[PDB]
Design a protein around this nucleic acid. Structure first.
Lengths: 193, 191, 193, 191
DNA sequence: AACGTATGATTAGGGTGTATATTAATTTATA
DNA sequence: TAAATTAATATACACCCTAATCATACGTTTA
DNA sequence: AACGTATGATTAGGGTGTATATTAATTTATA
DNA sequence: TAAATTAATATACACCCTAATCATACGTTTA
């Protein structure tokens, strides 16, 4: 049993035409939406063997995700899905594959879209990083002990290290006195000049 | 003639694999994107009878509306479109009648999604017919040439200069005591 | 009528002795504190002509400020105040004029004390400033436009001024362009080197 | 012999006025404080029979207990004490019986006030018989020699050094990323 | 018009104290 | 553990110092 | 013992995006 | 005034980059 479903788009307020359209494709019974509850009602009405007709994909849901649900539904209840606006929906519909086909493809595409958004986050991040990484921004860790250094205290330490170098102290002593690695002290040394 | 087209996603930098996968589907000749000009080149290369292969919808355009253009292009030049991840496309392929259909469908689905994502984040284009055709509403730019306080003006410029100089956002912000979000704003706006 | 008032100090818990002591000076009726409400009671009891006896100043209040109140009270109701611990206290109040006296002096002193704490604030402050002012710390206003300068933006401005100087632009133009005084620009000039 | 003693209060820097104000009461010889050593000097100068003049109680000591000492001293050496802002004292100094009395009284009043102000703010002296005669309670000094983290030790010292060098508190704080109160703590503790 | 140079006011960057509610680190009582 | 106890920190309130700047003005020299 | 010099791990100072509740500044509707 | 509307700011959440440092070890040279 052929079933239609219409719902006036706020940009396309005409109804009647839409209706006629539907019948023009066989719509025997037609639900009309005044949350879209009617829709659900219609979907519950149809069953294996019937054909559900609508003018355009978007009439199957307020957002893509929902469309998926809708289509899925029909797919399981094994109801033919027919969409008016599609050129040649007519000659093709008679193809043994087209149904299963159209249904799946729609789902796919759509899903391939959601998991594009669920990553819009990182994507733009990774996108930005890369751009930067190209500009030569990421430069590892900056000196932890040296003037300018973030933490003012380390600045103090840095200086004392130096002072202790001019004072001619011994590396080992410097290290222990400032709780630093020898290597590090050396770095401060061959760095000072 | 089977033709592939690859372009490394910033999140998926591997290339080689992508390549092989293309060949795995028949790609004889393969164009690689290093604006996406290569793409346009590949599209011009193909012609009635060939098959254009790609890994995923998005490789056909930076934004959906471009994809539409792409797909539409192929549809008219009558080139088979094949997407590595919507494998079933394989079937219908080879029956000139159904091929159109797919494209046609692919289009509608996308064209639709182009709203559900376009009617959500509403806009630096309304500042060319409201501020360039009258007087703009809301607070005025604090940092930009013209700006009331001359010093801000100076700052604005330095921000820019530092952008061309390719400096990092964070550094700019701190150097000018501004928010990143603001520097951003100065960025998008410059153009 | 001679009236005494006792209240055991937590450091001096003996009572009885204190009592005797009071009587030893004439206490006919004696109030004993077990907020110090009894005290207020006793104070209300006395009247012009009576003598209020206590062992020590502090028995007149929980803090100096209160003692003042107490004493002031007695002074107005014209009640003789006597304090035991004072050497020659009798020899003293055996004169009628040494009453007015003691009362006033106490008040004075005490007041001259509160008005010492009332300023303990500014005192230590002014005290500290001075020390510093001596150490040569206070150094006026530091440069507003120059590298290092507090506000990063002005730092930016400073530089641009310079740049515009090397670029050989004119003072006046610099000034207007950076919303600064000529004098100031000159300062930046006659400074750079 | 009438003797005065002046010392400019940091809140009342005028000197000269204070001086005359002393002479206005008879001050023949006047000692001026530039620890208060002059004061002690003046006190040693006076002899039974003389009168010691000062503007206000507080000029007799840095803290109350010292005043007591001062007053007591004068009381024994039998020197008249006369305080400028408690003018009514003049009415009586003549007679030595009322003189003692006043002092005696002045003492009690003060001795008293010495509690109402001593039993309120409850101490860097209990760290010489608890931490220098056992083990100290509470958190350990974070900045001080001995301190666990060696770097902290280094900082501590620099704070000190900067104190002797006579630097300003605020600067010290910022330079060592410490709180002012903390720097204070290091100050009072040093000695 | 810019430049060069003054002069009295206002000022922003720096200072001096004090005090309280929190969050550390330790030793020392319970349960 | 759960106290008890003392160090730091984070914040506020209150108000002090003083050379840079600002606002101004006024001859003189460059455009 | 220090010095001189390596080598693999961990890391702290720097980065990249995004998003929300507030507090600015303006123009533009009311009442 | 009271909206309405757009700029900045102040903060958080999420997670990426990478040369200094740390921890280590191991011959060699100074005390």
């Amino acid at each position: 049993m052929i079933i239609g479903y219409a719902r006036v788009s706020s940009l396309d307020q005409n109804l009647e035409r839409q209706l006629e359209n539907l019948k023009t494709f066989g719509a025997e019974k037609i639900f009309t939406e005044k949350n879209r509850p009617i829709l659900q009602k219609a979907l519950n009405f149809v069953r294996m063997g019937d054909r559900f007709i609508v003018e355009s994909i978007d009439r199957l849901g307020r957002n893509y995700n929902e469309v998926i649900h809708t289509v899925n539904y029909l797919k399981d209840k094994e109801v033919q899905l027919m969409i008016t606006s599609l050129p040649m929906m007519n000659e093709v519909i008679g193809n043994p594959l087209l149904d299963k086909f159209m249904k799946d493809l729609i789902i796919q595409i759509l899903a391939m879209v959601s998991e594009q958004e669920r990553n819009e986050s990182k994507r733009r991040q990774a996108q930005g990083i890369q751009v930067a990484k190209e500009k030569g921004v990421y430069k590892g860790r900056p000196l932890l002990y040296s003037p300018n250094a973030k933490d003012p205290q380390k600045r103090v330490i840095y200086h004392r290290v130096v002072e202790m170098l001019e004072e001619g102290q011994a590396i080992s002593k410097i290290a222990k006195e400032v709780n630093i690695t020898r290597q590090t002290v050396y770095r401060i040394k061959h760095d000072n000049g």
